Amino acid sequence: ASAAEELQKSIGHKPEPTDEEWELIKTVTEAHVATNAQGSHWKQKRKFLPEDIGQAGKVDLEAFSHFTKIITPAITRVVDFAKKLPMFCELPCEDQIILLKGCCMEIMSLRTAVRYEPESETLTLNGEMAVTRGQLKNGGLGVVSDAIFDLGMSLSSFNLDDTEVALLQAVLLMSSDRPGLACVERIEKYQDSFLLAFEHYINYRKHHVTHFWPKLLMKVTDLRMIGACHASRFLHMKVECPTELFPPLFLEVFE
Ligand SMILES: O=C(O)Cc1cc(I)c(Oc2ccc(O)c(I)c2)c(I)c1
Ligand SMILES: [As]
Ligand SMILES: [As]
Ligand SMILES: [As]
Ligand SMILES: [As]
Ligand SMILES: [As]
Ligand code: NA
Numbered sequence: 554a555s556a557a558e559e560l561q562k563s564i565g566h567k568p569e570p571t572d573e574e575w576e577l578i579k580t581v582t583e584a585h586v587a588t589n590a591q592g593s594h595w596k597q598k599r600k601f602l603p604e605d606i607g608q609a610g611k612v613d614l615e616a617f618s619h620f621t622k623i624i625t626p627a628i629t630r631v632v633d634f635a636k637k638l639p640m641f642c643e644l645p646c647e648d649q650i651i652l653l654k655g656c657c658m659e660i661m662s663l664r665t666a667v668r669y670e671p672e673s674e675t676l677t678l679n680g681e682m683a684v685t686r687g688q689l690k691n692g693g694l695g696v697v698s699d700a701i702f703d704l705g706m707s708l709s710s711f712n713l714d715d716t717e718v719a720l721l722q723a724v725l726l727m728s729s730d731r732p733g734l735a736c737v738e739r740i741e742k743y744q745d746s747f748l749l750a751f752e753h754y755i756n757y758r759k760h761h762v763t764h765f766w767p768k769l770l771m772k773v774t775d776l777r778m779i780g781a782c783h784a785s786r787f788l789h790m791k792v793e794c795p796t797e798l799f800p801p802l803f804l805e806v807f808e
Contacts, residue, residue, distance in 0.1 A: 669705025
């Protein structure tokens with residue numbers, strides 16, 4: 554189980570998901586697939602943003618406007634993902650907003666990075682709007698745009714499926730280091746159940762890529778970095794752009 558994990562590996566075998574883990578895996582996957590804008594066919598049904606909005610330095614009002622106008626639906630799908638996870642529900646109100654505010658940008662940026670399109674060198678926001686590096690940058694994200702784009706390009710080789718993306722989200726969600734958490738121990742035990750099932754799913758997947766698990770975990774910290782760096786970007790925006798231009802849900806998640 555969680556203990557018999559050493560010998561098994563120490564002899565050279567890689568345990569695949571136990572039956573209990575297979576259920577957790579299906580729960581997390583369904584939760585993700587059901588709340589991910591579009592699905593399978595997300596890329597023929599997407600519109601590029603006119604090459605003039607991104608103004609191809611103050612934040613470009615037009616881009617910021619187009620981006621903030623569709624941010625509420627994005628945040629909402631993240632809360633929805635969390636709600637479909639039994640472990641999340643087993644936590645106190647106080648802790649739940651904490652976890653959500655903490656992983657929101659981490660998960661959202663993962664969802665747009667995983668949909669990087671190398672042909673047109675674009676990322677797609679909310680499954681509809683496809684933007685370029687500069688557009689997203691000038692829209693208000695600054696270097697965050699570069700971070701997500703670089704993550705996206707690197708992720709191409711990982712060939713992640715819905716389950717792997719879902720498990721990543723689950724690991725980001727259950728972060729017991731968020732300041733102000735009450736149930737630090739319980740939340741850490743949950744992230745452990747996810748990481749254990751995740752690693753096992755990876756052994757079952759058999760990616761023809763060396764040290765997949767470790768490299769994959771490094772992406773975790775990058776997403777955490779993208780989030781922390783976005784919070785700063787948020788302060789840079791609250792000092793230029795006016796409040797009226799900040800969707801109420803967008804304001805409560807990041808401040
Ligand atoms: O793709 C999805 O599911 C969700 C998603 C939606 C958007 I709009 C988005 O861009 C942001 C995010 C924060 C921010 O302050 C600004 I300005 C723009 C990203 I990155 C991801
Ligand atoms: As609930
Ligand atoms: As509360
Ligand atoms: As608790
Ligand atoms: As950064
Ligand atoms: As920053
Ligand atoms: Na650049």
